Amino acid sequence: HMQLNPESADLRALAKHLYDSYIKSFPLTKAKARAILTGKTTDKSPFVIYDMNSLMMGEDKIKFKHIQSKEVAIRIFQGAQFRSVEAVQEITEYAKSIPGFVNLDLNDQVTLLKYGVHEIIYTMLASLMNKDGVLISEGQGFMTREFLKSLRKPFGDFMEPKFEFAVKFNALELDDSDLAIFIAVIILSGDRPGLLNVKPIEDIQDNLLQALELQLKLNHPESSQLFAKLLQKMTDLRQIVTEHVQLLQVIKKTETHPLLQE
């Protein structure tokens, strides 16, 4: 049976430390995202882009964090790629707070993040999504799934696999406490190619996996095998990163950010 012992309370404090660090590193949390999407907040209501006219109005009235193609589909995709750059910085800052992580060979630290950030971005996009669309511009905007889908090939299909993932992932009803540990388990994957010292990465992952399992048992009385289900999702995420990477080939060879410039 489960007991509240020194080992369990260490795993609870590890879970609490990752939660705290998660709140620090990602401004817009799932709790906040959900309050916006369900109209259960006093915060300013996001501008809905649902067609070409509301996008035109939206570009003006949703002031973005950077900024020029005549083509709407390309300008949307660009904003997405810029926000993904920002997301890498946030996820790296989070990685530094995982006990043992900054103690790994810097080269191994770079490899874990290099392969992980795309899996963590799709995880965190789900937090921002419902069946109708995705919160953008840290929640100033909402862009509908069908408006994204109406964009000319090959841009019309860029977000569809994220929405597919998100419909099934959000049905698990994870909260920010669950996701903080989930995201830390993904970063510490000992099977990324080109790692020097695997064993020290698996030792931290083993501790994170124990913490995740305890988190999901305490937090989710309704699904006794959520732990198993959540590991099956890490298996999925690989595939959607595969589809994303092969689509970034088509785009780059078929069509034409300030921190890359410096």
Partner: peptide, 11 residues
């Protein structure tokens, strides 16, 4: 490009 961002973000 990614490595570069991660590396400076790490230091």
């Amino acid at each position: 490009g990614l490595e570069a961002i991660i590396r400076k973000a790490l230091m």
